[PDB]
Design a protein around this nucleic acid. Structure first.
Lengths: 111, 226
DNA sequence: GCATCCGTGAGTCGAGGG
DNA sequence: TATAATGGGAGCTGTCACGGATGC
RNA sequence: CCUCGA
């Protein structure tokens, strides 16, 4: 179904704050922000899709995402807060795209 | 949820299929209901103060404390509660009952408590001298429902008794939530001075908690049954 | 057991015109 | 790179005999 | 595709 102003603004806010949370997880962990983003994304979507991302220096497979997710679960509560923020950001991003997929059709029908 | 009409169930509560969430909304499944964008946040700020009242000794009911709605005294004939200080009147009305604070210059010189069954005879800002009637008690006078009497001290003088009540109650304050804002505080959470309730785009439109209180969420934009 | 919808076949060689 | 924009559009049908799945 | 020839 279509997004109301409030639902839209909420999802966009969650996406923004989740990207900020990924940057903060890069600051704390010393890990690569892209690898962190890919692990959060991987766990959000499922084991159905984990593939090799072109830019990543490490092959993305369930073993490395499990190691990285366990390194991300081993941090203090106030440092574990950003993991939940990023997970919520990913899920909000997914639902935002899926809720706006009709606009693409309405624009592409003209080309 | 249509605009202006409120929820008939509370955030976080289990619900059964067919149970109405609102006058025009019937839930088709069972589970936990959740609030989607409450447009009005009501903060009940808690207040602990000390007030006083004088009553005929024949009317009084001796008690160490007074639960809400409990009878404070019973008056055979109309009684006139009279000012025992001089100053300007600050009339503070609750849902039922009142506070009456006399101030001279800046410092308050008196704090009186008019329970239910006591009609104030003064206006806000009125100038009163000593012995001037501030209220009329008639019949039975009882504690209001919103306010309770923690402790009672009493002093016998003449044919009257004077009560010093340690009162504890809460006062409401409503905040209208605009769509671009978001509530960062749960239902029934305790907040202090400076704590953030509702965030916003720009700092000047944020909702900060003035004093100590509890939070209540009303008029949600919609309700999500999971 | 007997109607019905889908798919696949239905001449060769020329010539020209494209 | 920022007003808002949120589910398509072309659509004539004059054959017939075969195997095979699909239904009553 | 069409038309034409055998």
């Amino acid at each position: 179904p279509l997004l109301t102003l409030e639902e839209e603004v909420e999802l966009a806010r969650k996406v923004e704050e989740g990207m900020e949370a990924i940057k903060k997880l890069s600051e704390i962990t010393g890990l690569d922000p892209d690898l962190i983003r890919e692990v959060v994304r991987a766990k959000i979507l499922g084991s159905a899709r984990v593939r090799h991302i072109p830019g990543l220096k490490e092959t993305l497979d369930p073993k490395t995402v499990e190691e990285i997710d366990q390194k991300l679960k081993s941090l203090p509560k106030e440092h574990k807060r950003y993991l939940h923020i990023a997970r919520e950001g990913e899920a909000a991003r997914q639902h935002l795209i899926e809720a706006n997929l009709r606009l693409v059709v309405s624009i592409a029908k003209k080309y | 949820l249509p605009p202006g009409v409120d929820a008939l169930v509370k955030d976080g509560e289990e619900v059964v299929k067919g149970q109405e969430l609102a006058p025009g909304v019937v839930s088709r499944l069972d589970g936990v209901a959740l609030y989607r964008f409450p447009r009005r946040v009501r903060v009940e700020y808690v207040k602990k103060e000390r007030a006083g009242l004088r009553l005929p000794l024949a009317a009084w009911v001796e008690k160490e404390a007074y639960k809400p709605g409990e009878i404070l005294a019973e008056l055979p004939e109309p009684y006139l509660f009279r000012a025992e200080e001089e100053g300007v009147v600050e009339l503070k009305e609750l849902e039922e009952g009142a506070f009456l604070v006399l101030r001279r210059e800046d410092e308050p010189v008196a704090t009186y408590f008019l329970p239910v069954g006591m009609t104030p005879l003064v206006v806000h800002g009125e100038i009163v001298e000593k012995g001037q009637p501030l209220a009329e008690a008639k019949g039975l006078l009882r504690m209001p429902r919103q306010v309770r009497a923690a402790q009672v001290e009493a002093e016998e003088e003449g044919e009257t008794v004077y009560l010093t009540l340690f009162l504890e109650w809460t006062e409401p304050k409503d905040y209208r939530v605009q769509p671009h804002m978001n509530v960062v505080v749960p239902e029934g959470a305790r907040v202090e001075a400076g704590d953030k309730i509702v965030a916003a785009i720009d700092p000047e439109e944020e909702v900060i908690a003035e004093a100590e209180g509890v939070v209540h969420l009303h008029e949600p934009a919609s309700i999500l049954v999971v």
